[PDB]
Ligand binder design. Structure first.
Ligand code: B12
Ligand SMILES: [Cl-]
Ligand SMILES: [Zn+2]
Length: 496
């Protein structure tokens, strides 16, 4: 076996741990810890970061009790090195620091590495640098080799004390950008095992499968964990519970998982859709679709995501004298809204949602030719691009114009693009906890400059309560818990 690291002592991540931390329930925490150890964990990932709380106070209370009471080492998961500094003092024995990246240059990287060197801790090294996330095999190797040279020579850390996180992206939303990102980590890990013998590799294996039903997640995580092990993986941040042995995985579900991990596309074979097909017949439902009356058949094109002969159905409508506005605002919008309903309820998964959007892209393409504007950015010091990109796709394919500023965007650059495009709203994403502070700060500035424009903050880490606290600063803020609340809020603020 591998050095498993337990993922449930996470305030943002785990709902149980969140509550227990907030209620100061030491014995409950310690139970969840021992539970994970029992399920196979060799160490534990502590993250007590959460919106509107002092991480350092929570740590000052919990760390002393854990030190006397835990069998396994702790992995300190904090963006703040101050937290890291504190923890190394309140937790003797073996330690692992989680992160050490070059996202914001050599200051925080060298800070964390010299901490690790001083207090004999292991280091996780994420492949994020000054130009962003290492998404390809070439990028991962380039960044990794730089960090290795730097930790081993400048900081004098031993290779054995370093765990490279070459980054686990979800491959379980439709987007063609994400298709090969699991493969690219895998092929990089193999390359770096050869180039850098001595070094650990760690992955947040659960990420590969984010935005899937727990049945399909367990499987995909397990298969991916295994492929990783065979390419150099030494450690893994997982739910010790939600991991099957490869033995307990049917040969079909196995082969499909592999097709998705390695992006094994062919004419008429979508890995992701096929893997989802399992876990939710074959010849029978096909015929049922063709039987539908066109009013509901055009609505089911949007809902099921059938762009296979969609141009043919869209003529039969216009041959009944139905106006192209009537088809867009009636059946095709009814379908889209229902995908919004289904996703907001938590029934539909993302890939079908994106094919829904792509059908409304191809439907407007045939009907209209022969709505408003949103300036969207991810805030300073946050590289989480995927959530915003989803919002881009949804609004784009429902008629809104989206100005996508990319990531790490400072308020000055946003307002520069507000002044140029005069949008109906500003969208700011950010999934990290410190990003919520950057949003507070930005609103303070926009209040200073005398703006009254709607600002939608869609970063996950956003208690509606804090958003109410932010209304004291800037009155026209909105929280979008999901990308669809985005589309609803753009409809309300333009009059649709
Ligand atoms: C895969 C992933 C990554 C990938 C990046 C993928 C990406 N987004 O580019 C990698 C591995 C590189 C990464 C890095 C890190 N991660 Co990360 N990541 C994740 C993960 C597992 C999923 C992200 C994802 O793609 N979600 C899928 C999308 C589709 O959902 P979403 O972005 O939340 O967006 C939805 C809504 O919020 C909304 N939305 C979001 N923004 C906006 C904006 C607008 C305007 C609107 C309308 C809507 C909207 O719409 C989307 C659809 O509903 C999350 C887990 C999670 N979300 O709980 C952790 C998570 C966000 N990561 C986190 C952390 C800390 C890190 C790291 C420091 C590493 C570490 N030590 O854990 C670095 C951050 C680097 C930096 N300084 O920026 C934490 C943040 C909490 C914290 N404060 O500590 C999380 C919660 C994990 C945890 N510890 O519980 N991560
Ligand atoms: Cl590069
Ligand atoms: Zn130094």
């Amino acid at each position: 076996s591998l050095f498993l690291v337990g993922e449930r002592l996470n305030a943002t991540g785990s709902k149980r741990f969140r509550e227990m931390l907030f209620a100061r329930d030491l014995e409950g925490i310690l139970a969840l810890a021992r539970e994970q150890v029992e399920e196979g964990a060799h160490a534990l990932d502590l993250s007590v970061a959460w919106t509107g709380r002092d991480e350092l106070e929570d740590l000052r209370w919990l760390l002393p009790h854990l030190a006397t009471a835990l069998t396994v080492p702790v992995m300190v998961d904090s963006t703040s090195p101050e937290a890291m500094e504190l923890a190394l003092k309140y937790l003797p024995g073996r330690v692992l620091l989680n992160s050490a990246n070059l996202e914001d240059g050599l200051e925080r990287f060298d800070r964390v590495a010299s901490l690790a060197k001083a207090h004999g801790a292991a280091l996780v090294v994420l492949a994020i640098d000054e130009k962003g996330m290492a998404k390809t095999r070439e990028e991962k190797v380039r960044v990794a080799l730089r960090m290795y040279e730097r930790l081993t020579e400048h900081h004098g850390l031993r290779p054995e004390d370093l765990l490279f996180d070459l980054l686990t992206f979800p491959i379980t939303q439709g987007d063609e950008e994400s298709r090969p990102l699991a493969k690219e980590t895998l092929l990089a890990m193999e390359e770096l095992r050869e180039r850098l013998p001595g070094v650990g590799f760690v992955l947040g294996v659960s990420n590969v499968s984010f935005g899937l039903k727990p049945r399909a997640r367990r499987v995909l995580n397990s298969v991916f964990l295994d492929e990783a092990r065979k390419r150099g993986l030494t450690a893994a941040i997982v739910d010790a519970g939600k991991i099957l042995p490869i033995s307990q995985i049917p040969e079909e579900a196995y082969a499909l998982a592999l097709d998705l991990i390695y992006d094994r596309r062919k004419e008429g074979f979508d890995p992701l859709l096929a893997f989802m097909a399992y876990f939710e017949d074959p010849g029978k439902r096909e015929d049922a679709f063709l039987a539908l009356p066109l009013l509901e058949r055009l609505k089911r094109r949007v809902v099921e995501g059938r762009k296979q002969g969609l141009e043919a159905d869209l003529e039969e409508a216009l041959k009944a004298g139905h106006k192209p506005l009537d088809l867009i605002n009636g059946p095709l919008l009814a379908g889209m809204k229902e995908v919004g309903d289904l996703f907001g309820a938590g029934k539909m998964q993302l890939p079908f949602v994106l094919q829904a959007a792509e059908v409304m892209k191809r439907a407007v393409a045939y009907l209209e030719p022969h709505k408003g504007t949103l300036v969207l950015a991810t805030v300073k010091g946050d590289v989480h691009g995927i959530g915003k990109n989803l919002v881009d796709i949804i609004l784009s394919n429902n008629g809104y114009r989206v100005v996508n500023l990319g990531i790490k965007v400072p308020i000055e650059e946003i307002l520069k693009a507000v002044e140029a495009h005069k949008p109906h709203a500003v969208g700011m994403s950010g999934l990290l906890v410190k990003s919520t502070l950057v949003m507070k700060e930005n609103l303070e500035y926009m209040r200073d400059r005398g703006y009254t424009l709607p600002v939608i903050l869609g970063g996950a880490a956003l208690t509606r309560s804090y958003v109410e606290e932010l209304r004291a600063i800037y009155p026209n803020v909105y929280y979008a818990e999901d990308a669809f609340e985005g589309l609803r809020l753009m409809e309300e603020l333009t009059g649709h």
